[PDB]
Structure 1
Amino acid sequence: MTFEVDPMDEPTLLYVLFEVFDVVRVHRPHRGVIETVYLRTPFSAGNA
């Protein structure tokens, strides 16, 4: 991606939302147990 912006006399940032499906599924199988599985697609940040 390549953005052409107006010049400013100040350091500015560039905030891009790469829109994903940031989804959590929450499993509570027994009393006092929370098991959550997170998944976002495409930009998955899980090692598993």
Structure 2
Amino acid sequence: MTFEVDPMDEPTLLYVLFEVFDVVRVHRPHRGVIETVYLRTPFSAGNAT
């Protein structure tokens, strides 16, 4: 990507918020047990695949 912006006299950051998918599945088999299966596809992270 190539952005072009107007000059400024102080440091600035460009924030690109790549939009993505990000879901969590909550698994609770027994009493007092929580299991989570994360996922975030376009920037892969989590358990399932």
TM over 0.5: same fold?
Answer: yes
| Greater than 3 Å deviation, 4+ residue runs | none
Q: CA deviation at 1:41?
A: 1.2
TM-score norm. by structure 1 comes to 0.88
Structure number with the higher strand fraction is 1
- Matched residue SS, 1:4: coil
Unmatched tracts of structure 2, length 5 or more: none
In the TM superposition, residue 43 of structure 1 has moved relative to its aligned partner by 0.7
**What's the C-alpha RMSD, in Å, of the aligned pairs?**
1.6
> What is the Cα deviation at residue 47 of structure 1?
7.2
Bigger relative CO (Cα 8 Å, ≥ 6 apart): 1
Distance 1:26 1:47 in 2: 12
TM-score, length basis structure 2? 0.87
Structure 1 regions of 5+ residues with no counterpart?
A: none
Aligned residue pairs total 48
**Equivalent-residue separation in structure 1 for 2:23 and 2:7 (angstroms):** 38
